[PDB]
Design a protein around this ligand. Sequence first.
Ligand SMILES: CC(C)=CCC/C(C)=C\CC/C(C)=C\CC/C(C)=C/CSP(=O)(O)OP(=O)(O)O
Ligand SMILES: CC(C)=CCC/C(C)=C\CC/C(C)=C\CC/C(C)=C/CSP(=O)(O)OP(=O)(O)O
Ligand SMILES: [Co+2]
Ligand SMILES: [Co+2]
Lengths: 197, 197, 325, 325
Amino acid sequence: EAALGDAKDALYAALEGMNRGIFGMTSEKRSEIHALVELLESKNPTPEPTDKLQDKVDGCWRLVYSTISILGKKRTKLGLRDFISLGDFFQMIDVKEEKAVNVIKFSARALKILSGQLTIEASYKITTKTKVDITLDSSTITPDQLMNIFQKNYDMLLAIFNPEGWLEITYVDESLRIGRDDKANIFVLERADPSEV
Amino acid sequence: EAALGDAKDALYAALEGMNRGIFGMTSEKRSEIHALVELLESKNPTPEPTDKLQDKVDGCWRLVYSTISILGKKRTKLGLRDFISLGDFFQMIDVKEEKAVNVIKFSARALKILSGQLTIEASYKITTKTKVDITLDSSTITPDQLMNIFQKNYDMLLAIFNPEGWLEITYVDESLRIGRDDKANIFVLERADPSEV
Amino acid sequence: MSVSSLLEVVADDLLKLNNNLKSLVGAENPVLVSAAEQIFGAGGKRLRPALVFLVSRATAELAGLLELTTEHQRLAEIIEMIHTASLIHDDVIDDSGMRRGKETIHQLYGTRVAVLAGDFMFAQSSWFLANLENIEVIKLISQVIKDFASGEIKQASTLFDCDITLDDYLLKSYYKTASLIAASTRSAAIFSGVSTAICEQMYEYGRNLGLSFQVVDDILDFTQSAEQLGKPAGSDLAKGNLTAPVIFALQDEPQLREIIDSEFSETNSLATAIELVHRSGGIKRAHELAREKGEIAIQSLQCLPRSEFRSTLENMVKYNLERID
Amino acid sequence: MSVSSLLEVVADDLLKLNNNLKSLVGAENPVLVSAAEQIFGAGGKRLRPALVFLVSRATAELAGLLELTTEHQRLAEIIEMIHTASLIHDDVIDDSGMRRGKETIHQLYGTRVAVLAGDFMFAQSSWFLANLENIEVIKLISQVIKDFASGEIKQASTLFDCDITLDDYLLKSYYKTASLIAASTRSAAIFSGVSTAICEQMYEYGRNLGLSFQVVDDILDFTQSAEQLGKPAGSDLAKGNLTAPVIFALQDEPQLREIIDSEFSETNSLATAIELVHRSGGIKRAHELAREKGEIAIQSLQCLPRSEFRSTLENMVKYNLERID
Ligand SMILES: CC(C)=CCC/C(C)=C\CC/C(C)=C\CC/C(C)=C/CSP(=O)(O)OP(=O)(O)O
Ligand SMILES: CC(C)=CCC/C(C)=C\CC/C(C)=C\CC/C(C)=C/CSP(=O)(O)OP(=O)(O)O
Ligand SMILES: [Co+2]
Ligand SMILES: [Co+2]
């Protein structure tokens, strides 16, 4: 199919330059992007999706759009306007051991020693046949230099990226899924080979 | 004519990148350039040149090669390795009033106010039929900011560029003449419209 | 009311100082000779060394000194080299092409020369100050330098922080501007030999005069048009630096808080924030902020016997306050 | 003989200092926190604060102090922040990507952060020093900073100047290196409370130790191979900076004077100049220059009662001299 296929390409096209929406976005572009993702989640090919977790939701998922924005005072506290480049965001969902990993990678644009990541181990469970109840277990900033940079603001950072709560899985394709957590956030993720992490 | 014509072009070609030889030059290229220059001055089309001053030597002459080099300690005292860009060197020879002007123009990065010049007015005579006798009258650094920069080293600068002495004229063509002053210096000058000064 | 009218009272002091500083900085180094002529725009008629010279002369007359000492003049040069060196370094840090229309040293000569020139002036000031041999003045001025560091830290820390208070802002204004003036005027009083009461009233004269000055420049970065400024109007706001007009506006306007929190994410959002400042009447409360600062300064000077020194000090205050009509 | 073997005697002092300086610089600013961890390579085992600590402890023991005071430790941190801030600023000035293999702050974080970091450390040192409240120590250290400025001026002034003497060169070596060590060791003695004779012998210990160090680094920029150095061998020469091996070579070799006067115009001319240095035996007279410097330093220490402190000070000298065989 190409209807939701070319709509998917359209969403991919509207996202370019917005940096996954993580440092804010003009409101008309946000309305546009939510229009496209609600068009997609209306056209869900995988209904009833929490019993199809392993062949649809299992795998390594790279973030391509989310409503999570880091702006203002916390962008400044984290050093994220001029020093640290918020890199990729992954959400490997492994259904065997019933896990949910959030890997948020970081950089410093010259420092080979700062190129670390924030890891967030979570464990989910299926409450509703379209929802999953996620709970946080472990959290980690590595290496110790990045942890040195973020440690005084560790809880703010984790809380930005904490997958706890629930995740209602609206759209599920083989290379793209769309989620909506309890905080009214949209998470548009795509497939990434687990070597990307 | 093409022998000394394309030899002239060859001299023009061997000079590119040597910055008129004013900040030194590898000895093999200096031997090459003096070879081409003695080839040219052996082919002087204007014998007895001091009686043909108004129609051959008259005009504004831009320096394209000379043995005058500013290297080492003097380059450092004048600020000529990292700050001030020694610009063009002109030698207008106006034969009516028996004048000889040396205009050495100067520059600085982004400093519109430092773009000035050292002016050196001299008066020549005709001692020998191929050889003029030059004597210094006036000297000037303008504007007052460049003079501020050079003033403590004014005599060194003038002495670098002082046309006083005598200038034995060889190979005076219509668009290129070659000089050999009393200090064994070679001066290869070309024609420049007096607005370039 | 004008600048020259104020500074003519110490025009001679100011000229000697400008000459010494041009001679010293730019120490027979070609590039530094040019940069010193560029930095010390001939005449020496700048506010900070002139305040040093006016408090110097007012308090000296009050004290019985017939001339200004060597300490007073080394102090005006310390103050001026510190101020200038800090502005050069601040333009290299946070790359700035212009400073009040004039082009910066960093732009004309490059970062390497600007850093060298600022370092050189800071070194010269360190040494002049050590050789004043007044431990209290050395401490005041070392506090000024340390407060430059504190101010850089706190400025980077409070970018886009809509919960900054007016005491926080006034401390950033102190760190930036008021600290060096307050220090210079208490030190001028100290070297004149007048009492600790007059030296504290001159610290408070310089502190509130420098706070008024900073508040009024904070206002003029809104009012003045984008051509009167080398910058767009409201460039302290675009950049995350919330000054007292914005702080007064965010006390009652919520929409402005949503605008600054997005870091002006919406398009045209800086101009919307500008008009919310002009509508909130935060500019008028900043105008009165500046007037109250200046009036504490004018009341600071009442300790000084009548003269044209302290009349010019009061006109320092008045000129500042009428720079915002 | 080794570096750690020397620095163990005050390893604990050095660790406390490194911790304080990492905490202070990088003052909960993300980029500055990283730059401080980068700058103060964990452990604090660097020569200059260790000299401060060894003269501090030797002279303190001689004086009857049971511990090092707060002044001694603020002084080791002053010395270390000054040295570090000057190296950062020197790498921005005269753009340098590396410093002894390690990469510079200017390269990793950029000029803006390097200038901010160096400025911050200089501000912190200014303030620490003012608050030592010792006018003689404040003067010594202000002279160190002023001599950094003098050294920049004189270094630019003497580029490619084949008529530079060995007293001129040794003054450039002082300005660059020896002044801060001499100041730190006289100040360490001063705060220990020992006599003016022992404080002058510690000024002379520090100035001849720092002169030997500079002479031996001047030699190793010829000796060490182009890869053992982050840069080609003989890079102080290529650049116009004539060190004591070249100055000793130009006393009898004329060809080298024609080579340096052309500013190495001929191709292969730097290598010809290098071999003329290695042939002139200017390296050996520089080697003996360094040994004589170090022996005045070792004779400087004879005022100190026998201890592990002055034995490590004598091994400071010996390690330096055996770094060049
Ligand atoms: C090295 C030594 C002894 C002391 C160094 C002093 C030090 C710690 C830092 C240098 C001084 C710096 C960077 C800033 C303070 C000077 C100043 C008035 C800055 C304007 S703040 P903004 O940039 O926001 O405003 P705009 O640019 O518009 O003026
Ligand atoms: C701001 C303030 C209070 C003081 C500032 C201090 C000041 C006046 C200047 C900064 C300090 C500078 C630039 C140089 C001195 C430090 C130093 C050891 C330089 C090596 S000289 P070279 O570069 O030739 O050698 P290489 O690079 O190889 O080490
Ligand atoms: Co700034
Ligand atoms: Co240098």
